[PDB]
Amino acid sequence: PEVVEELTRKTYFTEKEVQQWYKGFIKDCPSGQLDAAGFQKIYKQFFPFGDPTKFATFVFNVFDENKDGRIEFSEFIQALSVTSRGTLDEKLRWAFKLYDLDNDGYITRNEMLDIVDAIYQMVGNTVELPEEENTPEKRVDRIFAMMDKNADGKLTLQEFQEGSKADPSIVQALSLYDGLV
């Protein structure tokens, strides 16, 4: 009611859009607060023949802005606002937070390996990769050295932004790909 107004101000959605998403959200999760378990179950539906645990959790952590172990509707709608309608910069910053697991402003080779491993665990079963990129390690070796222009083992936001524009395939798991291609 009054809260719809605030979330309309804080997102790129219209009031009717905020409420339509709320209906869906609350029908899907009546308690209005979904946890990492529920979130993994959501991915499991669409990726039943993989292990989506890891990737779901990494994605969950970006949604859970206040880090309280739940996604409340405000966090849910904001995540969707940014990823669907944000500027290209905003979307890249969102994907950066996904990869930046410890949230220290840098993506390490280890952090990217974890993300890429999680994606392979969830979806690898279904794709056929060229032999040179058929493991997380092979894929990361190439894309991380490509992006790490300071040769310091840690990717800044700028390095990640510039790297992904140059080679959109780096974020091929995200809708952001289509904004870069």
Partner: peptide, 14 residues
């Protein structure tokens, strides 16, 4: 609801 769940996953991944 699978169509709701599909809709928001699409925003993220499709």
């Amino acid at each position: 609801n699978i169509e709701f769940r599909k809709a928001f996953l699409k925003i993220l991944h499709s």
